[PDB]
Amino acid sequence: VLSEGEWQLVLHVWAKVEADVAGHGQDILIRLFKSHPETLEKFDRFKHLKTEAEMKASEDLKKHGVTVLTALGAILKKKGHHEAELKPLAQSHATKHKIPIKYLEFISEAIIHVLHSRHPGDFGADAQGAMNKALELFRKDIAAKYKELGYQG
Numbered sequence: 001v002l003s004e005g006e007w008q009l010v011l012h013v014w015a016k017v018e019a020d021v022a023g024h025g026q027d028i029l030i031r032l033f034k035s036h037p038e039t040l041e042k043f044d045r046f047k048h049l050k051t052e053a054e055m056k057a058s059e060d061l062k063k064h065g066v067t068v069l070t071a072l073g074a075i076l077k078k079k080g081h082h083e084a085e086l087k088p089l090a091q092s093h094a095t096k097h098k099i100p101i102k103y104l105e106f107i108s109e110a111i112i113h114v115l116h117s118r119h120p121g122d123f124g125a126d127a128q129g130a131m132n133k134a135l136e137l138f139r140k141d142i143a144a145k146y147k148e149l150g151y152q153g
């Protein structure tokens with residue numbers, strides 16, 4: 001359970017992200033695909049992309065980055081009270097997209113890296129730890145839904 005102060009650190013940096021949702025979403029997906037190429041293979045939509053320059057040039061990738069970060073921002077702003085938001089997301093990611101919880105750990109690393117690069121003054125160690133706790137809570141709750149559905153592993 002995050003404290004109120006932890007949530008305030010999370011949402012303070014997140015309000016900075018929302019000034020350029022699309023640039024953040026590109027940086028995060030590109031970092032994910034470069035650091036963990038197995039993740040790119042889950043996207044029939046993107047797996048034709050073979051270089052970082054091609055990834056940066058893809059408008060459809062930039063669009064999907066906005067989809068992803070908009071969903072995550074709506075979850076963070078619930079400060080843990082996010083059951084309604086996670087149901088469809090866990091369902092689609094477990095049963096349609098076939099995304100292991102481990103790959104959610106990978107994108108969480110990518111999110112934290114990009115926030116640190118773009119917002120260092122609002123992403124000191126206290127805020128890094130709070131955002132790690134928020135993303136852990138996200139993964140914990142998704143993992144429980146995966147387990148219900150027979151996909152935790």
Ligand code: HEM
Nearest residue numbers: 039042043045067068071072088089092097099103104107
């Ligand atoms: C912060 C974590 C993530 C969030 C908030 C998120 C959010 C979303 C949303 C909102 C959609 C569209 C609606 C839906 O299908 O449920 C989507 C689609 C999808 N996501 Fe995620 N996602 C996350 C992580 C991942 C990861 C780590 C992968 C793969 C390694 C992944 C793979 C996919 C795929 C394959 C689609 C379908 C894309 C398409 O063909 O249109 N997601 N995601």
